Amino acid sequence: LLTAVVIILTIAGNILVIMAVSLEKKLQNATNYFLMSLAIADMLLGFLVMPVSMLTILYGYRWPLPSKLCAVWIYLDVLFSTASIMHLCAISLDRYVAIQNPIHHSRFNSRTKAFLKIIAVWTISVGISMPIPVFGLQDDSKVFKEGSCLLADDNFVLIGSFVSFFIPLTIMVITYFLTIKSLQKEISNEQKACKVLGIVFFLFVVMWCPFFITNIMAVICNEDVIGALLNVFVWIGYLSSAVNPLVYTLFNKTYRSAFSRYI
Ligand SMILES: COc1cc(CCN)cc(OC)c1OC
16 A cells, blocks of 8 residues: 555654764754754654554544544644644744844854754644643544544634644745745855755645645535545645655755665
8 A cells, every 4th residue: 555655754764864863973963953853753643643544544444443542643643743843834934044144043053942942842732732632532522423533623623723734834934935035135055055945845835735725624614525635635744744854854965875874
């Protein structure tokens, strides 16, 4: 099956990134520590969540797993997906701040800033993903629907899709536009950086955008077609966790050398 390839690529990429950060003396700085935290989140998703979804695919969408375990499963899904999304948003904000005024960025570029950023993004993701365990375990009807298990809370879906992908999307759009308008004011290094930023932004938009917009159209509005579209797009969005470890690292020569050495 095609879904078994994605889990293999996710875990392979995150192992390679983790060993590249940990076993290299030159890559150990704040940015690669934030990237390591992102890789940790993507590994936790691709280890605890995606094989369960593959078992759901194989089992005909009746839930073999315990019912109570589905609510915590949705909790882990939302937790790790939000963690990845605001990790990318914080990466984009840090890139814009470091590119617009590089002198003032180096005055406060210690490891304390990176630790505070990691703490902030994980606390934000935990707070966003907080109600699913508390309300889903008390009432089983809020997470189950005719054997299949999905978020049946419409208002929670709207709020947690507006605060997790419609604030970060506009933040990333604004920072990408401003970073493009900042580097163009000045040179193959800057053009290569612009190409990399554009590739990253458009890959993120292409990978993640259809899932949230069809999730919104599922609730705000033919049910089988929308359900199948959400079914395909939630697996398309899982492919982004196997792409961010590669794209954010392979543009460096040291990362390419380390990945060729370790394999
Ligand atoms: C918070 O954003 C979400 C992120 C995912 C990631 C799914 N792989 C699923 C959701 O609903 C279950 C979300 O809330 C609507």
